[PDB]
Amino acid sequence: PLAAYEVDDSTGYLTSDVGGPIQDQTSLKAGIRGPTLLEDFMFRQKIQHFDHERVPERAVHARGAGAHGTFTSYADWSNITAASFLNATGKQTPVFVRFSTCAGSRGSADTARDVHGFATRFYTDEGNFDIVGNNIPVFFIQDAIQFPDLIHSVKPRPDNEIPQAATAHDSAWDFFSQQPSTMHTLFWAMSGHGIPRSYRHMDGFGVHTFRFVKDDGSSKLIKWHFKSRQGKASLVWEEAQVLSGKNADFHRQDLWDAIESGNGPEWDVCVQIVDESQAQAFGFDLLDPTKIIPEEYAPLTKLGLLKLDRNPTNYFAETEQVMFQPGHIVRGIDFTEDPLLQGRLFSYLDTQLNRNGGPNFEQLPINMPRVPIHNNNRDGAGQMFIHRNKYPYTPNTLNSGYPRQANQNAGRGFFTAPGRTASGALVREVSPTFNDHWSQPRLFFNSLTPVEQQFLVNAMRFEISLVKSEEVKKNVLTQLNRVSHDVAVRVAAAIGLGAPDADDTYYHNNKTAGVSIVGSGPLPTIKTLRVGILATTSESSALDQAAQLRTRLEKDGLVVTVVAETLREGVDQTYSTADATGFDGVVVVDGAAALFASSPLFPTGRPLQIFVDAYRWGKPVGVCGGKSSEVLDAADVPEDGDGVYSEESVDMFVEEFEKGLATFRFTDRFALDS
Amino acid sequence: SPLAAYEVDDSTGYLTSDVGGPIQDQTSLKAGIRGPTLLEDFMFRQKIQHFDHERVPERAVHARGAGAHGTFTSYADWSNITAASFLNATGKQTPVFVRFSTCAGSRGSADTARDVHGFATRFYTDEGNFDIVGNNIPVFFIQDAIQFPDLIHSVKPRPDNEIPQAATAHDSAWDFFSQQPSTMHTLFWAMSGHGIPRSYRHMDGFGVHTFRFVKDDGSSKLIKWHFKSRQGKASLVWEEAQVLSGKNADFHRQDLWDAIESGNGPEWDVCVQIVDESQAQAFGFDLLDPTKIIPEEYAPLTKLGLLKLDRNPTNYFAETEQVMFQPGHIVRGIDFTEDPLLQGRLFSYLDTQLNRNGGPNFEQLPINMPRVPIHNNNRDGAGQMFIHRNKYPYTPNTLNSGYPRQANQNAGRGFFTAPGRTASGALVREVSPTFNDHWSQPRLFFNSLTPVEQQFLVNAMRFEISLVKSEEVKKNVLTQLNRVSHDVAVRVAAAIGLGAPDADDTYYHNNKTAGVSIVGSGPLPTIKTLRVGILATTSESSALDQAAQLRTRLEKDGLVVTVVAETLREGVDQTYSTADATGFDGVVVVDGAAALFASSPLFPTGRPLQIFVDAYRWGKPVGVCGSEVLDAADVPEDGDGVYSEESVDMFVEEFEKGLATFRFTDRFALDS
Amino acid sequence: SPLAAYEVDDSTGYLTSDVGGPIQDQTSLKAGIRGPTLLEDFMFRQKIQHFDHERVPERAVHARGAGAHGTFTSYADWSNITAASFLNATGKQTPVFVRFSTCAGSRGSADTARDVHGFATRFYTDEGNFDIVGNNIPVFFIQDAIQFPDLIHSVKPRPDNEIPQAATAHDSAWDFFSQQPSTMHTLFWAMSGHGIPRSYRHMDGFGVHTFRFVKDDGSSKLIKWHFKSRQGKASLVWEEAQVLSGKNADFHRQDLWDAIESGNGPEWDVCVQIVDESQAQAFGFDLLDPTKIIPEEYAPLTKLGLLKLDRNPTNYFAE
Numbered sequence A: 001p002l003a004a005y006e007v008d009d010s011t012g013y014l015t016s017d018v019g020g021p022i023q024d025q026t027s028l029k030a031g032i033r034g035p036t037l038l039e040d041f042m043f044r045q046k047i048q049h050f051d052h053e054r055v056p057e058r059a060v061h062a063r064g065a066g067a068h069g070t071f072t073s074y075a076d077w078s079n080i081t082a083a084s085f086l087n088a089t090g091k092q093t094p095v096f097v098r099f100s101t102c103a104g105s106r107g108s109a110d111t112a113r114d115v116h117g118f119a120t121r122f123y124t125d126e127g128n129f130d131i132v133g134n135n136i137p138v139f140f141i142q143d144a145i146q147f148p149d150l151i152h153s154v155k156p157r158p159d160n161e162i163p164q165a166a167t168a169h170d171s172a173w174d175f176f177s178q179q180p181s182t183m184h185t186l187f188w189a190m191s192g193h194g195i196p197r198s199y200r201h202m203d204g205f206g207v208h209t210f211r212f213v214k215d216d217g218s219s220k221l222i223k224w225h226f227k228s229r230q231g232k233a234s235l236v237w238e239e240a241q242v243l244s245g246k247n248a249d250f251h252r253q254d255l256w257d258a259i260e261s262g263n264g265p266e267w268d269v270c271v272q273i274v275d276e277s278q279a280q281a282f283g284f285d286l287l288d289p290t291k292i293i294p295e296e297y298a299p300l301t302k303l304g305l306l307k308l309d310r311n312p313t314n315y316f317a318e319t320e321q322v323m324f325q326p327g328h329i330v331r332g333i334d335f336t337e338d339p340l341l342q343g344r345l346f347s348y349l350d351t352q353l354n355r356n357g358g359p360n361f362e363q364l365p366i367n368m369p370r371v372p373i374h375n376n377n378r379d380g381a382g383q384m385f386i387h388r389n390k391y392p393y394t395p396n397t398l399n400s401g402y403p404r405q406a407n408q409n410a411g412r413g414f415f416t417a418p419g420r421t422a423s424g425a426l427v428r429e430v431s432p433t434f435n436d437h438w439s440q441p442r443l444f445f446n447s448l449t450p451v452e453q454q455f456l457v458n459a460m461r462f463e464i465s466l467v468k469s470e471e472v473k474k475n476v477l478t479q480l481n482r483v484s485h486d487v488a489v490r491v492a493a494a495i496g497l498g499a500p501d502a503d504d505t506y507y508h509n510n511k512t513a514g515v516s517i518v519g520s521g522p523l524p525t526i527k528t529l530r531v532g533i534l535a536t537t538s539e540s541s542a543l544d545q546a547a548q549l550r551t552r553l554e555k556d557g558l559v560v561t562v563v564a565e566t567l568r569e570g571v572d573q574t575y576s577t578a579d580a581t582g583f584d585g586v587v588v589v590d591g592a593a594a595l596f597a598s599s600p601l602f603p604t605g606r607p608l609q610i611f612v613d614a615y616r617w618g619k620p621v622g623v624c625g626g627k628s629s630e631v632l633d634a635a636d637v638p639e640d641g642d643g644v645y646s647e648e649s650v651d652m653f654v655e656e657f658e659k660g661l662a663t664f665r666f667t668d669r670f671a672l673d674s
Numbered sequence B: 001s002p003l004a005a006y007e008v009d010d011s012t013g014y015l016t017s018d019v020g021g022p023i024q025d026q027t028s029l030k031a032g033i034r035g036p037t038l039l040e041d042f043m044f045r046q047k048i049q050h051f052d053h054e055r056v057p058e059r060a061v062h063a064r065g066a067g068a069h070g071t072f073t074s075y076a077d078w079s080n081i082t083a084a085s086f087l088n089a090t091g092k093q094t095p096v097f098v099r100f101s102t103c104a105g106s107r108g109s110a111d112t113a114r115d116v117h118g119f120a121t122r123f124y125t126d127e128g129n130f131d132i133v134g135n136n137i138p139v140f141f142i143q144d145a146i147q148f149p150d151l152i153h154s155v156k157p158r159p160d161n162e163i164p165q166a167a168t169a170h171d172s173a174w175d176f177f178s179q180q181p182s183t184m185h186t187l188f189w190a191m192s193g194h195g196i197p198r199s200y201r202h203m204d205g206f207g208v209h210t211f212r213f214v215k216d217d218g219s220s221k222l223i224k225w226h227f228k229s230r231q232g233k234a235s236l237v238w239e240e241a242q243v244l245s246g247k248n249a250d251f252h253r254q255d256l257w258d259a260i261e262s263g264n265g266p267e268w269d270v271c272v273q274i275v276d277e278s279q280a281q282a283f284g285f286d287l288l289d290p291t292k293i294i295p296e297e298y299a300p301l302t303k304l305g306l307l308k309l310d311r312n313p314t315n316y317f318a319e320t321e322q323v324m325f326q327p328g329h330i331v332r333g334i335d336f337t338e339d340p341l342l343q344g345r346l347f348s349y350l351d352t353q354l355n356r357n358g359g360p361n362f363e364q365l366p367i368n369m370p371r372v373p374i375h376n377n378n379r380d381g382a383g384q385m386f387i388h389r390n391k392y393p394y395t396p397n398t399l400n401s402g403y404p405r406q407a408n409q410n411a412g413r414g415f416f417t418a419p420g421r422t423a424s425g426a427l428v429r430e431v432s433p434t435f436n437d438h439w440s441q442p443r444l445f446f447n448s449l450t451p452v453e454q455q456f457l458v459n460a461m462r463f464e465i466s467l468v469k470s471e472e473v474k475k476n477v478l479t480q481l482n483r484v485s486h487d488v489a490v491r492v493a494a495a496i497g498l499g500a501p502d503a504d505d506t507y508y509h510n511n512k513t514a515g516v517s518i519v520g521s522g523p524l525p526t527i528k529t530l531r532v533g534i535l536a537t538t539s540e541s542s543a544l545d546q547a548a549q550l551r552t553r554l555e556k557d558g559l560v561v562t563v564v565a566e567t568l569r570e571g572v573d574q575t576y577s578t579a580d581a582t583g584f585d586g587v588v589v590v591d592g593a594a595a596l597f598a599s600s601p602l603f604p605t606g607r608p609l610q611i612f613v614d615a616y617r618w619g620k621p622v623g624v625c626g627s628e629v630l631d632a633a634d635v636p637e638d639g640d641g642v643y644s645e646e647s648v649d650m651f652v653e654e655f656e657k658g659l660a661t662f663r664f665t666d667r668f669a670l671d672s
Numbered sequence C: 001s002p003l004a005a006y007e008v009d010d011s012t013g014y015l016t017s018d019v020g021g022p023i024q025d026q027t028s029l030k031a032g033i034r035g036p037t038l039l040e041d042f043m044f045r046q047k048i049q050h051f052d053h054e055r056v057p058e059r060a061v062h063a064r065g066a067g068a069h070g071t072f073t074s075y076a077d078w079s080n081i082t083a084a085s086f087l088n089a090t091g092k093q094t095p096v097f098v099r100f101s102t103c104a105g106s107r108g109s110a111d112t113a114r115d116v117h118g119f120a121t122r123f124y125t126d127e128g129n130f131d132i133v134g135n136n137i138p139v140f141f142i143q144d145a146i147q148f149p150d151l152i153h154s155v156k157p158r159p160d161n162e163i164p165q166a167a168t169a170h171d172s173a174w175d176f177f178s179q180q181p182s183t184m185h186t187l188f189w190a191m192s193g194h195g196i197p198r199s200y201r202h203m204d205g206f207g208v209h210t211f212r213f214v215k216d217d218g219s220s221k222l223i224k225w226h227f228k229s230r231q232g233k234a235s236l237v238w239e240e241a242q243v244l245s246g247k248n249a250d251f252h253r254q255d256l257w258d259a260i261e262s263g264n265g266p267e268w269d270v271c272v273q274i275v276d277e278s279q280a281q282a283f284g285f286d287l288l289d290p291t292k293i294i295p296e297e298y299a300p301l302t303k304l305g306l307l308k309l310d311r312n313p314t315n316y317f318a319e
Ligand code: HEM
Pocket: A057, A058, A059, A060, A061, A064, A098, A099, A100, A116, A117, A118, A119, A132, A133, A134, A139, A143, A144, A145, A147, A206, A207, A208, A289, A322, A323, A324, A340, A341, A343, A344, A347, A348, A351, A352, A355
């Protein structure tokens, strides 16, 4: 894919960057115990490179991971868009996708509670087209000019730089409560969408309304929705926290492993399509990025399949250096007057100068298009091209008038949708059509299941309880109360304040499909899900049981880890390094029961803690072999429990257990406010 | 070649963004036909962002220069003196890039400033890129690299007002020279015709430092690099260089470009003086001292190979502006010496490329890439153009099977420091007493110039020092010049109204050395590329006929001929309005044009005659073919370099000898 | 000096590093008196690293230029036409900094090239820095900013060999001018004596664009800036300019510096033509078009105040 740029070092002698064979292990010194010499160019070339390895992290979405893939169109979409990549059934275009958290620095944990990025580049035969989206369909703010306010508030306090990758501090909730537009995204982030099970188990959204533009000039309004084929799934908060410490790399490792095992994740790339006349028809403004179109109003149209199936060769060169822009647009697509989108168009082109340190960032391999470039851009630091045209100006006769101007009528040029207009005063004023900040947050809340609603309440209780300012806490209750009195009461109970009186201006009872995680039913596939088998080296029959279970589980593409006191043939991991956050279900072989009812080889009570944690976090758990009561009694897990299994037959154990893995979470183990 | 892969062809096709999307770039997107420009106009912003960022920092020195590609060819297998692969077989060819430059001026300053000149050569060898980063003068101003910023601050413009451009003719430069007497040897070279070469092709190149050749058995010898020009040695005269700086600031880069384009690519014999390590101090000075030459009488030149430049760049910025030379670009078979000027340069070039490139990946630019595989564990950095497959970039490793392997004297043709080298003594910030003679060699150089050349050097000093405002700096200058030569100090002092100090003969002597004089180097060995202006008129068909006939004859001998008249037409290249004597190496007036030399709205009053008179005054061969003309000009018919013939063929014969003589120095007055 | 707080005096004292450690900087630390230089010599490396990084990118245009400090003094309270604080009272003074330049040439190219010239003025007002980034010619070559790189690529040296420096006298420039006829007006100016001014002090400054003056009540008028020289208008002749480019590349910067040092700091009346919003298309051309002047017979100049340059910089690079 980027084969032309690969460098192989599987053989050969060390050389400088200019091909001179050298060594790099000992400095040149004036005598054997002498000082190092300035003339040692071997030393200086190697250390200079090392000294300059780092580049600025992205201003947001610093922490993330990418993979290569293919997009395949399901149809000829010419009848709605001139976009070349969508112009034929089965047409394939290479892609690169990067997923990320949003607030944390490089090296912060994947399983922070946060908005997540989902950025996709299509290397089309008419230019690179990027859709730079999030896993949440609405954004916090209604005007790009407010982005630094939002980001400053969410990022660590700037005196001490605390806390990392978290909204759980005063400044964030101060902003949220003073800028009520934030409520909708806030509710999404406080739901299980803020803590996805993996990048493969979340959807991607363009957020903004864009336009599809036909060759004839007619346009329609669209929203992009990348719908996961793996299904939707979340962690529970108290698992996400432990996982942040046990495996900061959880999401990037999950993605990397799925691709390597031939389970590359897939999404249906979809749009909602509506007429230009419907911009204000749905009870809100399609220019407002804090609003969704309910699927009951406009159904999803599937355009094609996105599949990620190839990991990068060098993370820095590919994932770190990929530079996405919403301004990377192609003929057939256009912008709308969404004031958040409008300002983004400026930001991405500008910020890449910061990251790259020079203007030629489009020439980096990962950023290059797959079709020829013909323009009069020249020079600049890091210029890799050697341009033959010595008359790089338009209009010219001395290069026969090339390159020629491309537009609607010639050379397949980009063109602005010709029906677009502007009218009015030049103003710094918010449209009153943007003013309802609360009805959609309530629509979202109403659409979650009872346990889902409790989890959202509990996320808010956790975070707001860490806000020191009594005034900020009260202000937060004021805003929450406008979305839902019941939310405000339940949150207030945790923080020892009174909720204010119900204000029903924005309350309503409407619901919408497709936003609940709990309500989206069992997972459509269990391939890649992780089963930890707790066993012991003290009983050769426990290992026999573990081996039989492994064979039967791996047959169905589950990723199996056998855990014992020490490593040996057939054991993957020791108890010392094992944790419940490492598994989607946990099985104990009854031969190992004694470990459950002290060792220098693992912390006290570790084998039982793995089982108890997994149970408490809602995972399918069980004992295989017939003798289950010693384990279940020690764990205080009821044998009759939903998602608790006990069979002597390995085949029968696995059949039941696999149903539990697809259910994924057993939500009856979590208490509800009365 | 790494460059061929990166050549971009825009001779056909529709305009695209840098990511391949077809676009237009002539009108901004606006809210209505007389409305404001939109922020969502990504076509506008990408184009202007690229323009806004086109410039990069100029080089800290040698900012003004020009480059060309070529080939080096070895004359022999030199394994007997060096392990260097590019020198290891008769006829072995290695691609090269050379950049020539002035030294002090900023990137838009005139080629014909009086200055030291750079001559940097990259050999893209089969064992790595090897650069010889040299000058047209064999000695440098200072004896320790730590003093480089002091020298450069003093010669560059005064930092309150940034005046004067590309010139040593100001107080700070002469204050430095007079306070740091190591400067005298290079100063005398810069004040000679070597400060104002006729072209880059008519100057030599010198590595300056003593280096080592190291054999595969580990033994070493000391060497000096000398690239000897096959075009011969030639200078401008100062008044000419001044006028040229205004009429054609691009004179040397144009000269090089045109010679290459016409198939007259310039050539040098790449030579060394080679001496034994036991002779470091045998010649009366220290070979570690970069202010000293080895006289050719003590060590003759051995010709190693031919350097030829024969192809111009495709894109100046990408190739010439972006080429980043380093004396650290060394290959097996060459090593450094303890010259404290060389020692510190090694640090500077690697560091300064960070400034110019803005990132650590500058060796990845096509002009800087080697022509052999790169195997190492350097990673990441801004502008990383590679995708490295080896995911265990550390040594020692087993996870990549211990690759890359270390290279050294024994294995993998590794670079190695000459194993005979040692150090002994205290760790000191002390100058060796062996460096202390700052005046004998400048006198050696002075003695070796011809009388008129000596006068030109005195006159360059009279010009510059007369422009120094401080009487105390001027006295201090006289003190140092007097230690080189009492007579020089006397003659300079005369022009500035001061008395010279009394003779101080400690460093005086009468020795001479071969190969340093320009005037004394005899006629040019070729006159190909030399420029002849034929002054004619459109008023007389005879004039145009004489010019045409003279042209075809001179052009066959590879002369570049320009016919000048009042207006352009068939046969006429240039108008009198744009013509100047600095545009020519010889000037011919055709008989039919006699009347112009005696007003017109088409050119300044007296222009035709001034071209002929300036050419004469500046020592160039001049002639009339077909005199009223020689009399109008005050040119003596019997003068050497003055030609008068009816016969086109006899005229051409005589005039072509005059072009080879090049300058007629009997036209310049000498001191009494 | 307006920038006194940032000045560094080195008229006394011992050499130090940038972190205040007294050091030397004349000889490298070596292993023996004829030995190699040591990596541990931090005195050498800090000095040379600084030198190695002294240069920055020259301006994309107007690279060759010179500057001075001065004062602007308002002739009146201009509230009647503008809310601008620096213009709100008779005799109110505001410090300025002005940079003059040629347009096409790189750093080091000659002052006396034939060219458009830059005339950029900063007013450090009590309500913020206000810049008028002007030229010595009142109209520009092109009618849309998107065409600027085309214009500049064509006039700057040919990109294969970088020839010629600081000159429109080559094919690519005249190709552009002939294919892009909006260029004609500025081209005629550049080909007149305005292309070779006798000095920065003998040329005028123009904002080129129509701007708006806005009152505190929100009403607005259309304006053009014209800085009228109090030294008079003067040009070189072309042959003279060519010779000067060789004999004194620094001619205009020296002339400015010298005039200021001798107490002859140059002056301009800062003026505007002021017309109503309704006259945008009334004069036979569009006031949005930067290739057009408003003839003075249609709209006379109003003098707003005096601009005087009277102090040279202390450090050219820094200022
Ligand atoms: C709809 C709301 C938004 C979404 C879905 C969004 C999405 C993203 C994503 C996914 C990335 C990381 C791309 C990657 O993986 O490299 C990103 C980076 C960035 N975003 Fe946006 N963003 C939004 C709003 C904004 C706004 C309003 C601004 C500023 C006006 C902005 C400025 C940036 C900057 C400076 C970066 C770093 C870009 C880079 O270094 O390449 N974002 N955003």
